[PDB]
Design an enzyme around this catalytic site. Structure first.
Site, mmCIF file in Angstrom:
data_model
loop_
_atom_site.group_PDB
_atom_site.id
_atom_site.type_symbol
_atom_site.label_atom_id
_atom_site.label_comp_id
_atom_site.label_asym_id
_atom_site.label_seq_id
_atom_site.Cartn_x
_atom_site.Cartn_y
_atom_site.Cartn_z
ATOM 1 C CG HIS A 178 -2.023 0.977 1.194
ATOM 2 N ND1 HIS A 178 -1.844 2.301 1.531
ATOM 3 C CD2 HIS A 178 -3.336 0.838 0.897
ATOM 4 C CE1 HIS A 178 -2.997 2.939 1.429
ATOM 5 N NE2 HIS A 178 -3.919 2.073 1.045
ATOM 6 C CG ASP A 188 0.257 -2.091 6.209
ATOM 7 O OD1 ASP A 188 -0.743 -2.122 6.961
ATOM 8 O OD2 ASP A 188 0.282 -1.470 5.119
ATOM 9 C CD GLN A 216 -7.436 -4.540 4.155
ATOM 10 O OE1 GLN A 216 -8.290 -5.362 4.489
ATOM 11 N NE2 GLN A 216 -7.738 -3.294 3.810
ATOM 12 C CE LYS A 243 -8.278 0.064 5.724
ATOM 13 N NZ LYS A 243 -6.910 -0.109 5.176
ATOM 14 C CB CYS A 259 -3.754 3.266 -2.040
ATOM 15 S SG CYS A 259 -4.931 4.598 -1.941
#
Ligand code: PLP
Ligand code: PLP
Lengths: 404, 405
Positions: free
Chosen positions: B122, B199, B202, B225, B363
């Site tokens: 991302h 990261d 997600q 999220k 992105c």
């Protein structure tokens, strides 16, 4: 203006503390919110929610448009020329940091100097210290007066050809002093220096026009504006803002990203907003602006001023009370009672169901100037009443009687 | 065990109609919907509980402060950090990564050194490192992809050397749904004396995340999220590293003492990294979200979401001219394109059917560049999504295929 009809909008005022009706005088620390803002944010979450940044489906598009609409409303609230001159921030602090890094690094160099004041909030102090440390510049201080006002005559001496920036507060969070921004900005520009204004204590008290002030940067927080936490506004003159490099990198602030040919940035304000913004807070902020605008700012100014006059009038009958700041003060009364520790006083007032704030109020130099470790602070906001002021006065009197 | 109906009952937006049709919200990967608990938690805090934090002398302030720190604690337990002091409140993943890139990066990365990222990253996990590399004059090295949406792991030993300070890698791809073999990468990364930033934006809503097991040095994720409010996120940093990191933003509450003569000194971490009034409502809501997710249980969600994914991938085989990107074991999202049609047209037509999917580059531009496409459609299958909605998606795609040729 009716304080009763206004108080009807804030549920927190129904809260009890230690078995007694809450009197919240701490508004200067953070403002209570009306049901409209809370319900605006909540309803957005409930029936409206999606991601912003011009998503292909409906909720996202509408959300984006709502966000930009809030931006517009904010721009109109402080009377900027264009909504593109406004950036969404976590708050005053982040805004100041953003300017300190983005603009400061390119416009401030070795041997140069920045000017602040002795009454500044730490938010408007430390980021400039960090900057000066980075590029090797000097931080100069506009000194105070015993009455809580800055010494203006010192400005010609503090300014020279090496002075890039004046960072000044619109209204003191402790003293309630309102500084003569116009004079300072006029004088500042003559030396070719930009001016950043900390308005965190300003925007809820009376109308603010950034075109009339001709200030180069302006920052404020939403949670003191009776809006939600985690949202604030940074206004920057377009000419300057368009030339400012990005601060945070990431999505949505980029035009294109390449791991070979590099990376390019989109235009401001969007250049300075990276990743998912805080949407609920923005909606709530919109609601807040609507509410305050609907009441009208001059009315609020009138009521709050009269309330202040009443309070200061009543506080004269308190023995051994020491007040700090001028007579023209906005929104707050800073005091100490005899030789008693501020936190003891605060605790006693808390026991009586009255909320005031104690400590250094995140201005240490200000405290240092007055040779005290701390101060008591009472805030009088638009929903505060004479009865509450009376509770404060009687409380102080009771403390004096009991503790001598 | 898990009931999608009982869960769906908690999310009001799912009752909404869009463009005259019952909403099927497949965009959860962009941002998640919230249950009534979270919304009402934040609202009720605002309504009856609200004051400023930072140890004000009066009651509401104290209680607010403790609530905030309690949320911090809950989060640390949620990702299984050793201490709540290893967690920092941030606006979201992006600010976290930037915070690390500036605070830690400036002191730990120098001229001639290099950082490693991957091609599926991302932009949030790309640009700040570009900025850093530009600042200190370092090199950004990239782990290349495979056509099936997986990283080429065999390339790593060559990419690492004694000059490699950091590996910034994604737990789960926001586009492909690829889950990277973090343990392996972290082992290899540490063998060369390099730190790892993960990261997890997600990841955290799909299954359990243990940072002690991963032994990752940095971990970031976003609250919105995770079915929480916007404008709040978590940055986990190993205590040993966090204690040596200088402050980034200056201001109140992150200072010990402030002097205009003797200078300025900083308080302890994490508080060193939290300047000005934090976002309190967001934190409360975040706490609520973590409670909700934990109450459902993560393995349950994982199983249900897995079965849903299998069903979806099974059904999508009947769509003509459907091109899927990524592996078969993917988590949470399906990235696709339909024939020669522009992704945004497909997205719009699906929107007309009351179905919300996302289009564009998501992105990640380099990822799109690797596949020789400007954009992809992406459908998210979250814990509140149903077979019914998948059927609607398939039929929708088929109808679009009929109409647009
Ligand atoms: C969403 C996301 C981000 C950015 O998160 P924000 O909340 O906008 O800050 C970064 N990386 C991945 C993989 C993401 O899914
Ligand atoms: C509150 C305040 C700040 C800090 O604003 P935050 O919302 O905490 O970021 C700065 N200056 C003044 C005068 C303030 O009252």
């Amino acid at each position: 203006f009716s304080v009763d009809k206004v108080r009807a909008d804030f549920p927190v005022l129904s809260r009890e503390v230690n078995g007694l009706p809450l009197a919240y005088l701490d508004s200067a620390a953070s403002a209570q919110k009306p049901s409209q803002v809370i319900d605006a944010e909540a309803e957005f979450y409930r029936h409206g929610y999606a991601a912003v940044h011009r998503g292909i489906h409906t909720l996202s598009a509408q959300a984006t448009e709502k966000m930009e609409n809030v931006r517009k409303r904010a721009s109109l609230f402080i009377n900027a020329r264009s909504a593109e001159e406004l950036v969404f921030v976590r708050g005053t602090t982040e805004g100041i940091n953003l300017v300190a890094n983005s603009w400061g690094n390119s416009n401030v160099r070795a041997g140069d100097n920045i000017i602040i004041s002795q009454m500044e909030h730490h938010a408007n102090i430390v980021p400039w210290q960090m900057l000066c440390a980075r590029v090797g510049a000097e931080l100069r201080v506009i000194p105070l007066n015993p009455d809580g006002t800055l010494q203006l005559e010192t400005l010609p001496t503090l300014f020279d050809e090496k002075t890039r920036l004046l960072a000044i507060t619109h209204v003191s969070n402790v003293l309630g002093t309102e500084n003569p921004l116009a004079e300072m900005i006029t004088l500042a520009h003559q030396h070719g220096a930009k001016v950043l204004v900390d308005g965190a204590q300003a925007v809820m008290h009376h109308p603010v026009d950034v075109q009339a002030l001709d200030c180069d940067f302006y920052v404020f927080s939403g949670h003191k504006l009776y809006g939600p936490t985690g949202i604030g506004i940074l206004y920057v003159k377009e000419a300057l803002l368009q030339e400012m490099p990005p601060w945070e990198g990431g999505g949505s602030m980029i035009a294109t990203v390449s791991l070979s040919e590099g990376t390019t940035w989109t235009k401001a304000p969007w250049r300075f907003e990276a990743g998912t913004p805080n949407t609920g807070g923005i909606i709530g902020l919109g609601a807040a602006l609507e509410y305050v605008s609907a009441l009208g700012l001059n009315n609020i100014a009138e009521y709050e001023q009269n309330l202040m006059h009443y309070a200061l009038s009543q506080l004269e009958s308190v023995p051994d009370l020491t007040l700090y700041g001028p007579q023209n003060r906005l929104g707050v009364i800073a005091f100490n009672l005899g030789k008693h520790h501020a936190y003891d006083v605060g605790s006693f007032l808390d026991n009586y169901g009255i909320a005031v704030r104690t400590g250094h109020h995140c201005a240490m130099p200000l405290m240092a100037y007055y040779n005290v470790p701390a101060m008591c602070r009472a805030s009088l906001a638009m929903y505060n009443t004479h009865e509450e002021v009376d509770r404060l006065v009687t409380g102080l009197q009771r403390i004096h009687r009991l503790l001598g």
